[PDB]
Design a protein around this nucleic acid. Structure first.
Lengths: 21, 317, 291
DNA sequence: AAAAAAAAAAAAAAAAA
């Protein structure tokens, strides 16, 4: 599984959703 | 009644697929568009070979393609599409000969040939848009193995060379990467990854996606985003009081153009592609906002911070 | 006793704008310089037409502009500048005829025309310097919508072709991109996006920016940086009693985890010092400090 | 020193994995 969240509509890209925090 | 593009697409699909072409199903329309794109690029078996600058392997592949029998009448395509006996006539009539260039036709001055070439180009563009939308839709439930890092994800969708040529502003892949890394001429177009693409059943009818339309969550999301975009875009939907499979569009996202967070290098410093990311902060990342234009007015919806694909998978649970 | 480079501009501005031409306001000087730049590029109303190789629409636009009535005396330009009846005479004499090239002037041998063309070149250079500084000043508060990625931020400022031709060194824009794509040679110049341009109230009087000169924070930042540069440059300005949009310059930068550890060199009255980078653009830093 | 925020995205006619 891939947890990337590409930037869009002015939002900030995330290289890993889980690691955030 | 309709622009040239949608009229030509409807004519081509009706001629090639007869009465089996369902005009209210996204999957059938996508299959028909993909098949028409294959036919118009000289890629169906039994068509002219591409040997102008082909490597020996390419020469062999194209020769094999030429020798093989072309699709026969009544062949099954997709799930509920069946070719009619008169698709060969359409292919021979409305498909420009391999290598045809608009300059040569204009020099010849044949009005019919110019009209046919314009129709062919319009159909290429429409089918490219439909196929990009279908790629987005597939990305909502099936992750692509190619995309493993943000650098790779930056170039989605991955499509063939002719797909990039037809709609450079929407199609990514190898050719978009090459163009971006190469010299940027007067015709260079930046990859607008999250451009609005109305569903295939609205794309061939001209009804631009707007508030009040009754659509599904997956179709709307594939229209305004793709699998790995943030999940807050799901706020653009509201389930109805009936079955609930098809809801209503309440508001659409706005392409953010408020502020730029870059920091250009100067006096020996180094550039920063994004101030928030390189700051190693988390408080701001969890309290971001997206500007959704609704019927009432603009609203700032806080980002959910999880991929759209994962959000949909969790919701389906 | 000012150099001809600035004497020509001062004389032109005076002869054109009368006494209304304030020589102590950056906005006034910038508006006057922009108007004179337009005048010397035949871009005003009722002036010559650039139809050397213009396309159909461009030809029609040039013809319409040529037919369009020229400005009249007393016209309000900017906010605090009013034309003088003498301007036409000036525009009749000092402005070279459209298409005139230094080759023809030199071949003719007329000393008066040669000096006129030299003065015209100097005036164009001065006006382009003023325009570049004005672009930086504007960028420091409101950012261009064109600049979205570092690739686009590499070509700021975005000015017309004439501006690039007059001062290729400082001006960027579409034509700078075209020249970069073309080739590199002896005539080619490398864009210096952070060159020190003295403020217009200092440029037209040969007042080189130096430590101990009273300047607004935005003035100094525009004169040593632009909107998207690193925020650490704010360390070069120190306020005064009640600030009041006035302060002083304390240093001028050189070369006009660890990523945030990069340091910039600042020259002070004593010696070179290293100041840690902030990581936030000057635009955002000023916006946040405002409120 | 020389040489759809009076005037900046989406779609169309030009160019062309």
């Amino acid at each position: 599984s891939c947890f990337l969240v590409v930037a869009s509509h002015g939002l900030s890209a995330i290289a890993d959703s889980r690691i955030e925090g | 009644e309709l622009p040239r593009n949608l009229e030509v697409f409807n004519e081509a699909c009706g001629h090639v697929f007869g009465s089996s072409f369902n005009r209210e199903d996204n999957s059938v329309i996508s299959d028909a568009a993909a098949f028409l794109f294959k036919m118009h690029t000289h890629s169906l078996d039994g068509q002219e070979a591409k040997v102008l600058r082909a490597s020996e392997k390419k020469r062999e592949r194209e020769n094999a393609k030429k020798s093989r029998k072309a699709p026969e009448a009544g062949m099954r395509v997709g799930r509920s599409l069946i070719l009619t006996s008169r698709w060969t006539e359409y292919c021979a009539t409305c498909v420009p000969a391999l290598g045809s260039k608009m300059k040569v036709i204009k020099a010849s001055g044949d009005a019919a040939m110019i009209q046919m070439m314009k129709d062919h180009n319009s159909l290429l563009r429409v089918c490219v848009r439909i196929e990009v939308w279908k790629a987005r839709y597939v990305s909502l439930v099936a992750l692509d193995e190619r995309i493993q890092t943000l650098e790779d994800a930056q170039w989605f969708p991955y499509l063939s060379g002719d797909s990039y040529r037809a709609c450079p502003g929407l199609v990514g892949g190898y050719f978009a990467k090459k163009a971006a890394a190469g010299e940027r001429g007067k015709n260079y177009k930046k990859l607008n990854q999250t451009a609005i693409i109305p569903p295939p059943r609205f794309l061939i009818i001209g009804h631009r996606l707007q508030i009040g339309d009754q659509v599904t969550l997956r179709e709307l999301l594939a229209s305004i985003a793709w699998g790995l975009c943030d999940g807050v875009l799901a706020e653009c939907w509201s389930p109805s009081q009936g079955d609930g499979s098809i809801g209503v569009v309440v508001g659409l996202p706005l392409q953010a153009t408020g502020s730029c967070f870059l920091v250009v290098a100067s006096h020996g410093l180094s550039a920063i592609a994004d101030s928030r990311i390189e700051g190693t902060g988390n408080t701001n990342l969890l309290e971001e906002c997206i500007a959704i234009q609704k019927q009432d007015g603009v609203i700032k919806c806080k980002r959910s911070g999880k991929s759209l694909y994962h959000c949909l998978k969790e919701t389906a649970g």
